[PDB]
Amino acid sequence: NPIQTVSVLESAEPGTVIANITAIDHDLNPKLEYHIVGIVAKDDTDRLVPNQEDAFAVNINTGSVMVKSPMNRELVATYEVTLSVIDNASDLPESVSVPNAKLTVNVLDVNDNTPQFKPFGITYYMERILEGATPGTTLIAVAAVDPDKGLNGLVTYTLLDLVPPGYVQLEDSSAGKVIANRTVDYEEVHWLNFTVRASDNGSPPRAAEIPVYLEIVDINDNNPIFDQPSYQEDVPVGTIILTVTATDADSGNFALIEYSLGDGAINPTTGDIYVLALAKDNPGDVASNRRENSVQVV
Ligand SMILES: [Ca+2]
Ligand SMILES: [Ca+2]
Ligand SMILES: [Ca+2]
Ligand SMILES: [Ca+2]
Ligand SMILES: [Ca+2]
Ligand SMILES: [Ca+2]
């Protein structure tokens, strides 16, 4: 039987006798030479891989075929190894037994690659998010990769360390797309920091966890709100009659209120009133990015 087939573990060490070929009565004949003439290395994609003639060897005398250099399925998933045997001075008198042997050698997978995060080298994701993002908005998409065959490198994504629970979720437990299932608010959360965990479906499962920091950006989405709904012969001219006050639940100059009135007179800073009402946020920025409430006063 010249043409055999044998499977091997990629983790199988050098020298590990994988196979054994013989001639008929190779023991009646001690003067036989077994030789590896060519090696043909290919991917799990059937693609071809050059310069792999160093991968196996044969014992010249016994024809036991063993590994010579360490393998890796993620580089080469199958070899076709060609062998000859040479009778010394007998058959084919002037000296080979052809048909040659074709040993087919399939490399069985060991779950030895643990998931990586694209882009390669990433320690953390940070991106920057603007509030009011609608629930079911893709907030950020991470992803990851496993080299190993079938199960051993089917990647599945888990989400941990979730700062307020229930705020975001993976839409689908087989893709690192983080959606929000609560409308995004700076006036609740300044940071949605969580930890994404990709894992293979390996016999003992290998995985990886990496943090995901999402910086939450303020927008002018809160009016200034006044304290009271309404604030109600001749005194001295400067003396202050009453202060008013409003608050604006945003932060970065989107809280600075400019207090103003129709008639009299006012102070934009304090909200104080003198003698001869409105609140407006974000001064120094265009009207269309401002908001306001109006109180009455007697
Ligand atoms: Ca490997
Ligand atoms: Ca592998
Ligand atoms: Ca794996
Ligand atoms: Ca808000
Ligand atoms: Ca805001
Ligand atoms: Ca505001």
Curated annotation (Swiss-Prot):
Name of this protein: Cadherin-23
Residues of the full protein shown: 2176 to 2496 of 3354
Known glycosylation sites: N20, N88, N181, N193
Disulphide linkage map: none
Function: Cadherins are calcium-dependent cell adhesion proteins. They preferentially interact with themselves in a homophilic manner in connecting cells. CDH23 is required for establishing and/or maintaining the proper organization of the stereocilia bundle of hair cells in the cochlea and the vestibule during late embryonic/early postnatal development. It is part of the functional network formed by USH1C, USH1G, CDH23 and MYO7A that mediates mechanotransduction in cochlear hair cells. Required for normal hearing.
Complex and partners: antiparallel heterodimer with PCDH15. Interacts with USH1C and USH1G.
Coiled coil: none
Domain Cadherin, residue spans: 1-117, 121-226, 227-298
Domain notes: Three calcium ions are usually bound at the interface of each cadherin domain and rigidify the connections, imparting a strong curvature to the full-length ectodomain. Cadherin repeats 1 and 2 mediate calcium-dependent heterophilic interaction with PCDH15.
Cell compartment(s), UniProt: Cell membrane
Tissue expression notes: Particularly strong expression in the retina. Found also in the cochlea.
Disease: Usher syndrome 1D: USH is a genetically heterogeneous condition characterized by the association of retinitis pigmentosa with sensorineural deafness. Age at onset and differences in auditory and vestibular function distinguish Usher syndrome type 1 (USH1), Usher syndrome type 2 (USH2) and Usher syndrome type 3 (USH3). USH1 is characterized by profound congenital sensorineural deafness, absent vestibular function and prepubertal onset of progressive retinitis pigmentosa leading to blindness.
